[PDB]
Design a protein around this motif. Structure first.
Motif, PDB file in Angstrom:
ATOM      1  N   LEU A 240       0.450  53.890   5.385  1.00 26.79           N
ATOM      2  CA  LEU A 240      -0.301  54.388   6.147  1.00 26.79           C
ATOM      3  C   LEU A 240      -0.272  56.017   5.496  1.00 26.79           C
ATOM      4  O   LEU A 240       0.692  56.567   4.999  1.00 26.79           O
ATOM      5  N   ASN A 241      -1.451  56.192   5.847  1.00 26.05           N
ATOM      6  CA  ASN A 241      -1.674  57.957   4.772  1.00 26.05           C
ATOM      7  C   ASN A 241      -2.582  58.395   6.014  1.00 26.05           C
ATOM      8  O   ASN A 241      -3.438  58.950   6.308  1.00 26.05           O
ATOM      9  N   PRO A 242      -2.281  58.220   7.643  1.00 24.53           N
ATOM     10  CA  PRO A 242      -3.002  59.408   8.573  1.00 24.53           C
ATOM     11  C   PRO A 242      -3.602  60.435   8.126  1.00 24.53           C
ATOM     12  O   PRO A 242      -4.208  61.446   8.224  1.00 24.53           O
TER      13      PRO A 242
ATOM     14  N   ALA B 269      -3.648  62.157   2.520  1.00 20.82           N
ATOM     15  CA  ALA B 269      -2.643  62.890   0.964  1.00 20.82           C
ATOM     16  C   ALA B 269      -2.958  62.259   0.400  1.00 20.82           C
ATOM     17  O   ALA B 269      -3.480  60.674   0.091  1.00 20.82           O
ATOM     18  N   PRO B 270      -3.486  62.079  -1.616  1.00 19.22           N
ATOM     19  CA  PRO B 270      -3.643  61.990  -2.123  1.00 19.22           C
ATOM     20  C   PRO B 270      -2.780  60.904  -2.789  1.00 19.22           C
ATOM     21  O   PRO B 270      -1.729  61.473  -2.777  1.00 19.22           O
ATOM     22  N   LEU B 271      -3.319  59.805  -2.979  1.00 22.11           N
ATOM     23  CA  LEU B 271      -2.536  58.680  -3.597  1.00 22.11           C
ATOM     24  C   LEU B 271      -1.516  58.462  -4.634  1.00 22.11           C
ATOM     25  O   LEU B 271      -2.942  58.246  -5.310  1.00 22.11           O
ATOM     26  N   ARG B 272      -0.610  58.161  -4.917  1.00 19.24           N
ATOM     27  CA  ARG B 272       0.129  58.496  -6.680  1.00 19.24           C
ATOM     28  C   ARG B 272       1.144  56.574  -6.449  1.00 19.24           C
ATOM     29  O   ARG B 272       1.456  56.498  -5.854  1.00 19.24           O
ATOM     30  N   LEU B 273       1.337  56.466  -7.584  1.00 18.74           N
ATOM     31  CA  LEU B 273       1.319  55.114  -7.536  1.00 18.74           C
ATOM     32  C   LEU B 273       2.461  54.534  -8.196  1.00 18.74           C
ATOM     33  O   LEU B 273       1.550  54.754  -9.730  1.00 18.74           O
ATOM     34  N   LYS B 274       3.886  54.821  -8.701  1.00 24.17           N
ATOM     35  CA  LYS B 274       4.470  54.292  -9.856  1.00 24.17           C
ATOM     36  C   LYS B 274       5.044  53.179  -9.701  1.00 24.17           C
ATOM     37  O   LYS B 274       5.509  52.517  -8.893  1.00 24.17           O
TER      38      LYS B 274
ATOM     39  N   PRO C 273      -8.079  53.675  10.683  1.00 26.09           N
ATOM     40  CA  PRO C 273      -8.480  54.590   9.099  1.00 26.09           C
ATOM     41  C   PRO C 273      -6.662  55.152   8.551  1.00 26.09           C
ATOM     42  O   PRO C 273      -7.752  54.713   7.139  1.00 26.09           O
ATOM     43  N   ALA C 274      -5.652  54.749   9.341  1.00 24.74           N
ATOM     44  CA  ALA C 274      -4.663  55.704   8.315  1.00 24.74           C
ATOM     45  C   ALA C 274      -4.275  54.285   7.649  1.00 24.74           C
ATOM     46  O   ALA C 274      -3.434  54.662   6.592  1.00 24.74           O
TER      47      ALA C 274
ATOM     48  N   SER D 250      -9.217  54.891  -1.379  1.00 25.15           N
ATOM     49  CA  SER D 250      -8.606  54.287  -1.460  1.00 25.15           C
ATOM     50  C   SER D 250      -6.720  55.103  -0.445  1.00 25.15           C
ATOM     51  O   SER D 250      -6.007  55.287   0.190  1.00 25.15           O
ATOM     52  N   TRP D 251      -7.695  56.462   0.056  1.00 23.51           N
ATOM     53  CA  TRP D 251      -6.684  57.128   0.552  1.00 23.51           C
ATOM     54  C   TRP D 251      -7.913  58.411   1.126  1.00 23.51           C
ATOM     55  O   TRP D 251      -6.931  58.868   2.184  1.00 23.51           O
TER      56      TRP D 251
END
Length: 120
Positions: free
Chosen positions: A83-85, A88-93, A26-27, A118-119
């Motif tokens: 990896l986002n265990p 937290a809200p994903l942001r992508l630049k 899940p992470a 996605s998160w």
């Protein structure tokens, strides 16, 4: 299943995100970026750099190459391991650099409309 997201187009060159959230971890989020070129000119020296919030962790894999041939030639794919265990809200630049029609292209932008799936 999470749908793809077109994030960039310029003169026939496109960038597309694919997402996978493997149930057995899940992470983990696997983002694959796909670069395609439908113009009359090759794309060369293609590099894609990425940044994410410090609240989560990112590791890039080497891309499949740095050239996207003209007229629907084979795409460049690059995998980003996320990896986002803590969920937290994903942001992508992204920062894109490449050569096209003998001009140096440089583009930077944050991806809007990232699916919560996605998160979450």
């Amino acid at each position: 299943p999470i749908p793809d997201l077109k994030v960039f187009e310029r003169e026939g060159v496109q960038l597309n995100l694919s997402f996978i959230r493997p149930p057995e971890n899940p992470a983990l989020l696997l983002i694959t970026i796909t670069a395609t070129n439908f113009s009359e000119g090759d794309v060369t020296h293609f590099i894609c750099q990425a940044a994410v919030p410090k609240s989560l962790q990112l590791q890039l894999q080497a891309p499949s190459g740095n050239t996207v041939p003209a007229r629907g030639g084979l795409p460049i794919t690059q995998l980003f391991r996320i990896l986002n265990p803590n969920k937290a809200p994903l942001r992508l630049k992204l920062r894109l650099t490449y050569d096209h029609f003998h001009q140096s292209v440089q583009e930077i932008f944050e991806v809007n409309n990232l699916p919560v799936e996605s998160w979450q």
